[PDB]
Structure 1
Amino acid sequence: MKEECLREDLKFYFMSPCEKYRARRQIPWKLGLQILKIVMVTTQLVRFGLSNQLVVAFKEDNTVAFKHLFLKGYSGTDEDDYSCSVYTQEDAYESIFFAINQYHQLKDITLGTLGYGENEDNRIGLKVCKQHYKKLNIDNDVELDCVQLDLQDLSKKPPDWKNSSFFRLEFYRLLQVEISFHLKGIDLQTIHSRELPDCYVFQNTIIFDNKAHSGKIKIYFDSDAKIEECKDLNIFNAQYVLVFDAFVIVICLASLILCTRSIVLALRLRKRFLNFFLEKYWEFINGWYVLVIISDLMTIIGSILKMEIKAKNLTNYDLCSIFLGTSTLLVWVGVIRYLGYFQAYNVLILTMQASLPKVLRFCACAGMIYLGYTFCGWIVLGPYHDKFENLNTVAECLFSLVNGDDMFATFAQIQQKSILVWLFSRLYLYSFISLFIYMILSLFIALITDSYDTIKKFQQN
């Protein structure tokens, strides 16, 4: 009865986990442990999110306060990736001297627990560095002159730094001016929970940048904040965030072992049935377990990166957040496997499998037209439209137009000063919107719907 054994095993392989508890009466660990994964991974993600939100909020608020304190005539919103700009030789001098003078008077201007930090040389002071082209008769070599203005020099009642030869900034040869200083802060919004609060160090840099030499000096403010140790503080669990992460690793490591077992054992079952079929005369490979394995790997990597982040007091979580969020997404998506055996919960996945070939084939022809339109729009409307300035911006604009978004602003944001470009823009926009939206969206939704219809008629036969 080896054929009996083989066919009974094949019957066991395809029955629902509920039915696998009737065929052989065994506990479904790969379902309870997966529910545990969902719960624990979601809790970990939410708690990580809340904590890093607090840290990011503190850093951003301090940066905004720094910009108000040190940038002259700062509205409150950044003009661009740069914060301020100046167009006159006297406005630039005013901005530079304002920054230096506001540094000099920090203790009487700041509304927070700020102080004077220390550079690598361990001195409380300010560094100003200018870059010029060496000398109409200019060379390509950049001269770099730096000065270190200490608080005792700045404090001098008849100040001398203002009349020094360093601050005579020939502007036709000037590339940039940098002001760098260090500040120490204390997060007092944590002390309400009995603890030693977090101490920060801010590496603040102000760049007055005219690399373009086009009349505008762009002013950049960058603050790099790191958590240091509170060396001067007297206020009259990391352990329990490292054991919860260890638990998540344990659950995910177990799920990797169970799922890898199934994938290996499923392949052996296919071998046993293929050999018989050749003797007498994909439904074996489960891609959901391939998804679970990737989820587990990403969760383990994210938990390890998060433990490393907390252990050495880091403040950059972009990679760890990406791993944790993608793992949580994949966990919630893999929940669908435990509703897919159900007789009326699988229309979506079946339709996706049906569609995928036809959908991919369709997107090839539409992709070529989309790429041609992207290149044409970037080359023609790029100088005259801000939704067509960069190739990725053109792609995003075209995708949104296919989804019918900002169609009137896109039409109306082109100026009629050039009539040729305006006419071309009208022709371009009406040809893409018409062609793409109507024809291509019709034929794409129609393919999906006919795949869904084919899936439902098999279900009904």
Structure 2
Amino acid sequence: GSGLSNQLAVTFREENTIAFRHLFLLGYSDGADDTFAAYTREQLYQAIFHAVDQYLALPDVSLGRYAYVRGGGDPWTNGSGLALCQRYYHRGHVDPANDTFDIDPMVVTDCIQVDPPNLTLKFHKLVNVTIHFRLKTINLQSLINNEIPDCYTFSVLITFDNKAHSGRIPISLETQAHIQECKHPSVFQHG
């Protein structure tokens, strides 16, 4: 009943999240979560594009059934499903060879909008790169616990964090889950 309903819901959120890591993170394998990172530019660009591409090809490859979500204040412009954002110092003259730098640390955010069916990164002044998108899905497992399937909206955030400017960029994927009743649920139930 209820204690089970909660565990099933948490489990549903974790399983989807694990699925998202395998689908969107290039070269991801279980147990690699806090070491997973990019070390070269090619790796980073390959990781960034693979994630956007897997987002576009989702209906054709995923074992789940997800609906795209469009709109919202940040940072999806209208019509937008995926936001590929770039944060860097407004001014970042960095010259270790002469032991100097000149910096305006105000952070600028450039975001590219991608609507569900090119990028020039600023490495020396890059704070980070994020990929934001939402996916909706029905929680069918509920039927086993004799409950009406729920309506989930997963907010997915992939972060390529360069805040340490260490030559190592850890990559992570996190999800927030908004749960509500579906508009029209119908489960035939007599026999």
Task: Give the structure-2-normalised TM-score.
Answer: 0.83
Counterpart residue number, 2:112: 147
SS at match of 2:22: helix
Q: Distance in 2 between matches of 1:146 and 1:130?
A: 6
5 Å-filtered alignment, 1:33-432, equals 49-80=3-34, 84-120=36-72, 123-135=79-91, 136=94, 137-152=102-117, 162=118, 167-192=119-144, 195-231=147-183, 233-236=185-188
Deviations 1:198-227 (A, max 9, x none): 111101000100100010011121100121
Residue 85 of structure 2 aligns with an amino acid whose one-letter code is C
Whole-angstrom CA distance in 1 between matches of 2:27 and 2:45: 13
- For the aligned residue pairs, the C-alpha RMSD in angstroms reads 2.0
The offset of 1:140, in angstroms, is 1.5
Task: Provide the TM-score with structure 1 as the length reference.
Answer: 0.36
Deviation string 1:171-222 (CA, Å, 9 cap, x unpaired) is: 1110100100000011111224555311111010001001000100111211
Aligned twin of 1:321:
none
Instruction: Say which SS state the counterpart of residue 139 (structure 1) adopts.
Output: strand
Tell me how far 1:54 sits from its aligned partner. 1.3
Structure 1 stretches lacking a partner, 5+ long: 1-46, 153-161, 237-461
Give the distance between the partners of 2:11 and 2:27, measured in 1 at CA.
24
The gaps in structure 2 that reach 5 residues or longer are: 95-101
Between structures 1 and 2, the one with greater strand share: 2
1:234 Cα deviation (Å)? 4.5
Decide whether the 8 Å contact of 2:80 with 2:113 is kept in 1: no
Number of residue pairs the alignment of both structures matches: 175
**Structure 1 counterpart SS, 2:9:** helix
Contact 2:5 2:142 in 1 (8 A): no
Matched residue SS, 2:167: coil
Structure having greater relative contact order (Cα 8 Å, sep ≥ 6) = 2
Runs of at least 4 residues off by over 6 Å: none
What CA distance in whole angstroms lies between the structure 2 residues aligned with 1:228 and 1:193? 17
Inter-partner Cα distance in structure 2 for 1:216 and 1:230: 43
Distance 1:98 1:62, change over 3 A: same
